[PDB]
Amino acid sequence: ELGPAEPMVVVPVDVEKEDVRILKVCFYSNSFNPGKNFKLVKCTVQTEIREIITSILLSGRIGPNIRLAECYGLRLKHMKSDEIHWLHPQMTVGEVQDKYECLHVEAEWRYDLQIRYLPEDFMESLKEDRTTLLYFYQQLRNDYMQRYASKVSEGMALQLGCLELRRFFKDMPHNALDKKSNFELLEKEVGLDLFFPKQMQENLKPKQFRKMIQQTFQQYASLREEECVMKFFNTLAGFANIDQETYRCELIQGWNITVDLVIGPKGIRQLTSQDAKPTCLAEFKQIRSIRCLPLEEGQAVLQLGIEGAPQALSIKTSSLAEAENMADLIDGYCRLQGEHQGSLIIHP
């Protein structure tokens, strides 16, 4: 009875065979594969999204000393239509699944890990955390390639593809590429269609092409990674707007008016018809309660609650989906900037 001491028994969590779920989660990474790298995630029907994001982040699979983990989100996308749904951090796998794989079977979907909720500082704080910085740079870079790079002036794409070459080949000698040898290699081994758009190669005497790359490089030849990336961001902020997102939506009031909504870290703001000067509509500090209602022509209403406002603010959106994505982004920034636990959304 003075033997050692026996601790209290602990019933070890074990899990139902059919509550197991295995998700395929794609991320960006310095493969010659952008959105074709992925990691299976093992879990339960009742693990919350956070959990998944953290389990990926900690895997160290995407890079090292990570700080702004709250910035990441998880995004489900239907492959044919481009329905996309942002899975809010605290809803469970199970909910997701009977919410939407309801809609098309597993293989027509994809989840991507994605920077979604930008820091209040945006550039200022990204710099503090390399890994993320890069990830977000990759994410954007991907977009650029997929969406913009064919649409922008040739001379411009040339700039950004070199920007990447220097960026991508840290550790390569400042003047490698001039050697026709190493060049031929680049296609054979990696292909330039990763850095420059198709049409480019297919539009230009290839001798010519080479020329403009060999020489455009030397312009960037001397720059570190952080520098490349920063430059690229700056450049892209040119046309694309890249810390905010934009929603065309009516908005319900005395007289109802259709408007373009900008949302990002600086709050939720009216993008007046086109202008540099968007002036502010609602402050995250000020929000109190987000909410979604569906309406009988497939549309729906996001509606915030604003303390200091007597009336609420009721935005009419083109889909229930759109309403909830906006909802997520808002509760996101709220989550990030507010000192308080849990979301602000509601479902009576």
3-state secondary structure at position 255 = coil
Q: Which residue has the tokens 């939720």?
A: 268
| Helix (H) / strand (E) containing 315 | strand 313-317
83: closest CA among 334, 318, 306? 318
Closest CA to 337 of 117, 90, 73, 127: 117
Residue with tokens 């001379």: 155
Q: Which of 220, 212, 62 is nearest to 137 (CA)?
A: 62
For the domain spanning 1-117, the CATH number is 3.10.20.90
Residue 246 phi, psi (nearest 5): -125, 130
Alpha-carbon separation of residue 276 from 120, 122, 228, 246 (angstroms): 20, 18, 26, 14
Token pair 């160290």 in the structure block, residue: 60
Rg of the chain over all Cα atoms, to the nearest angstrom: 24
Contact 73, 54 (CB under 8 A): no
User: Can you spell out the DSSP letters for 42-107?
Assistant: EEETT-BHHHHHHHHHHTTTT-SS---GGGEEEEEEESSS--EEEE-TTSBHHHHHHHSTTTS-GG
Q: Residue 307 gets which letter from DSSP?
A: T
CB 37 within 8 A of CB 62: no
246: tokens are 């934009």
Please give the Cα distance from 77 to 17 (Å, whole number).
27
| Domain covering 242-348, topology | PH-domain like (2.30.29)
Burial class (CB in 10 A: 0-12, 13-18, 19+), 115: buried
* Burial of residue 231, with CB atoms counted within 10 A of its CB: 0-12 exposed, 13-18 middle, 19 or more buried: middle
Q: What single letter denotes the amino acid at residue 257?
A: I
Interacting residues of 193 by C-beta distance below 8 A, sequence separation 6+: 201
Q: How many CA atoms lie within 13 A of 148 on its CB side?
A: 19
Tokens for 178, please give them. 């001039």
In sequence order, what are the residues at sequence separation of 6 or more whose Cβ sits closer than 8 angstroms to the Cβ of residue 89? 48, 49, 50, 53, 73, 335, 343
Write out the E strands in 3-49: 20-27, 37-44
Helices (H), the chain: 49-58, 93-99, 123-126, 130-143, 154-168, 180-189, 198-203, 206-220, 225-236, 320-337
Helix (H, G, I), strand (E, B) or coil at 246: strand
Angle between helices 206-220 and 154-168 (to 10 degrees): 60
Whole-angstrom CA distances from 122 to 125, 133, 177, 183, 244 are 6, 10, 35, 37, 10
Q: Give yes or no for a contact between 343 and 88, defined as CB atoms under 8 angstroms apart.
A: yes
- Domain spans, the chain: 1-117, 118-241, 242-348
Q: Exposure pattern of 251-265 as b/e (b: 16+ CB <10 Å)?
A: beeeeeeebebbbbb
Tokens for 47, please give them. 């693990």
Among the listed residues 8, 149, 143, 132, the one whose alpha carbon sits nearest the alpha carbon of residue 73:
132
Cα–Cα nearest to 44, from 66, 15, 64: 15
Give me the resolution in angstroms, 1 decimal.
3.2
At CA 27, angle to CA 23 and CA 29, rounded to 5?
A: 145
- Write the CA distances from 193 to 130, 186, 280, integer angstroms: 26, 10, 41
Q: Is 182 helix (H, G, I), strand (E, B) or coil?
A: helix
| 294 contacts 300 by C-beta, under 8 angstroms | yes
Task: Calculate the CA dihedral of residues 247, 132, 240, 208 and round it to 10 degrees.
Answer: -150
Phi then psi for 202, rounded to 5 degrees? -75, -10
Query: What is the maximal distance between C-alpha atoms in the chain?
Result: 90
Q: Judge whether 66 and 57 are in contact, CB under 8 Å.
A: yes
CA gap 108, 113 in Å, rounded: 17
Q: Which CATH architecture does the domain made up of 118-241 adopt? A: Up-down Bundle (1.20)
Q: In what order do the strands lie in the sheet with 292-295?
A: 279-282, 267-271, 259-264, 245-252, 313-317, 299-304, 292-295
